[PDB]
Amino acid sequence: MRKIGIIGGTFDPPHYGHLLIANEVYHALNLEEVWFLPNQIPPHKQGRNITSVESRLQMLELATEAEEHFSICLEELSRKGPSYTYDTMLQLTKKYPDVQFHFIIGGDMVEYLPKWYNIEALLDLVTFVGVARPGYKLRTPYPITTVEIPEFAVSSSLLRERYKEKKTCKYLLPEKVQVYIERNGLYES
Amino acid sequence: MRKIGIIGGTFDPPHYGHLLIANEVYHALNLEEVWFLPNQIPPHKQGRNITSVESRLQMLELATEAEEHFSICLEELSRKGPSYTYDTMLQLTKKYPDVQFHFIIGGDMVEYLPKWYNIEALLDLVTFVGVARPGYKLRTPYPITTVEIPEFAVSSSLLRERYKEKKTCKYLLPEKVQVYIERNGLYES
Numbered sequence: 045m046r047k048i049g050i051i052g053g054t055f056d057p058p059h060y061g062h063l064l065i066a067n068e069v070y071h072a073l074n075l076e077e078v079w080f081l082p083n084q085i086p087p088h089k090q091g092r093n094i095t096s097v098e099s100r101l102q103m104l105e106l107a108t109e110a111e112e113h114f115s116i117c118l119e120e121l122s123r124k125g126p127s128y129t130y131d132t133m134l135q136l137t138k139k140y141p142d143v144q145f146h147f148i149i150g151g152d153m154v155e156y157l158p159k160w161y162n163i164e165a166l167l168d169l170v171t172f173v174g175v176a177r178p179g180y181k182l183r184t185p186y187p188i189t190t191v192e193i194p195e196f197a198v199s200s201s202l203l204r205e206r207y208k209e210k211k212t213c214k215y216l217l218p219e220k221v222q223v224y225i226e227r228n229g230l231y232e233s
Numbered sequence: 234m235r236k237i238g239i240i241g242g243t244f245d246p247p248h249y250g251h252l253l254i255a256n257e258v259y260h261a262l263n264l265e266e267v268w269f270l271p272n273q274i275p276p277h278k279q280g281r282n283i284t285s286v287e288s289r290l291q292m293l294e295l296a297t298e299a300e301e302h303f304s305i306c307l308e309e310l311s312r313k314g315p316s317y318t319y320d321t322m323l324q325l326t327k328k329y330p331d332v333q334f335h336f337i338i339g340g341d342m343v344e345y346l347p348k349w350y351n352i353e354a355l356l357d358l359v360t361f362v363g364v365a366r367p368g369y370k371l372r373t374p375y376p377i378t379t380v381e382i383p384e385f386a387v388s389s390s391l392l393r394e395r396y397k398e399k400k401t402c403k404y405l406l407p408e409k410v411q412v413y414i415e416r417n418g419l420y421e422s
């Protein structure tokens with residue numbers, strides 16, 4: 045009954061881990077498509093200095109450009125304040141009543157779930173889909189759906205650090221995103 | 234004093250894990266270059282029915298084509314029988330006396346080392362470089378050099394299985410390799 049996947053994130057920068065998953069879950073659960081949901085202010089990193097919304101959205105667009113099963117949901121970029129997932133999903137559920145949402149999260153977020161705002165109410169609005177990530181375990185008391193994928197320990201923090209240190213980023217994120225980053229001098233490119 | 238990395242394998246099929254890693258270790262250890270060493274008969278899988286040497290070598294060439302720091306060593310394809318690493322390295326060490334070889338192996342092979350032919354003598358011919366792999370641990374009594382990389386659980390067996398089951402292989406191996414596989418109907422493409 046209209047299965048849609050949603051992968052929320054800061055995407056700073058978006059990389060192959062995000063694309064990997066998005067594709068894996070899309071296929072494993074036979075979803076109609078996957079919506080990438082960039083937050084405006086990460087709800088759990090409100091004090092962190094992060095790349096501007098404009099620069100993050102551009103990088104995301106470039107990462108999901110030629111991927112026909114991927115699109116971007118601008119719901120959080122359309123309202124002020126911390127982007128709590130519960131608020132986003134309450135609104136999305138009202139706007140798309142015949143859609144069954146599958147919220148895709150990596151191992152690290154799976155373990156973070158008890159810290160999520162209104163997690164119990166949120167569990168009634170979506171079906172979480174947890175995917176493995178190196179250094180994290182799919183350990184949680186909540187009713188998540190797991191999806192076996194070929195794990196990839198790539199991360200934005202590792203990427204930001206490598207750009208700063210002038211270290212290799214080959215194979216870790218799309219070429220166009222790399223171009224955008226170096227061109228704009230992001231992360232000390 | 235001429236640091237060269239060698240990544241031995243069956244490469245059936247070669248995928249992004251191999252390229253990843255080769256690149257990661259190339260950069261981490263400031264190697265001059267990396268040689269991909271396809272075996273003729275995997276020494277520890279002598280009874281396994283695998284893709285022909287011609288088809289494996291072609292796939293490897295396609296995977297390493299536009300990568301200037303990567304090349305192929307045909308040493309094992311030039312002699313009959315099981316391709317034991319000790320024999321290969323004894324010959325390579327004699328042919329390249331001023332080269333310090335760094336043999337790159339994934340977590341699974343790191344744990345397999347005690348089963349390797351002449352492992353103690355081989356440790357005097359090369360410096361093993363172990364890299365993490367999901368589902369395996371860099372646990373070993375031997376003097377390996379470790380290199381931190383962003384782990385990727387992609388594997389040839391998973392790929393062969395997915396091609397058979399008509400499952401997605403996006404992001405897991407080079408596009409040209411995928412084309413070659415589907416065209417030749419490998420793994421039940």
Ligand SMILES: Nc1ncnc2c1ncn2[C@@H]1O[C@H](COP(=O)(O)OP(=O)(O)OC[C@H]2O[C@@H]([n+]3cccc(C(=O)O)c3)[C@H](O)[C@@H]2O)[C@@H](O)[C@H]1O
Nearest residue numbers: 052053054055061088128129149150153160161177196198
């Ligand atoms: N290599 C990799 N392998 C497997 N998974 C990987 C991955 N790299 C990222 N991921 C995953 O991709 C996603 C995006 O990563 P990243 O850009 O860092 O996103 P991140 O900042 O972790 O946020 C994940 C989502 O959870 C929401 N959240 C988090 C915490 C609290 C609350 C709340 O409402 O109270 C909501 C947040 O707004 C966002 O929609 C994450 O789910 C992450 O686990």
Ligand SMILES: Nc1ncnc2c1ncn2[C@@H]1O[C@H](COP(=O)(O)OP(=O)(O)OC[C@H]2O[C@@H]([n+]3cccc(C(=O)O)c3)[C@H](O)[C@@H]2O)[C@@H](O)[C@H]1O
Nearest residue numbers: 241242243244250277317318338339342349350366385387
């Ligand atoms: N996703 C991934 N993440 C991290 N590492 C990954 C990986 N996928 C493959 N790898 C690694 O890439 C390499 C190639 O993989 P694959 O094509 O399956 O190669 P594989 O059949 O494991 O052989 C690895 C090398 O060890 C040699 N060996 C093995 C056992 C015994 C002896 C002996 O002399 O007695 C020698 C063998 O001839 C070859 O040169 C391996 O080192 C593997 O661990």
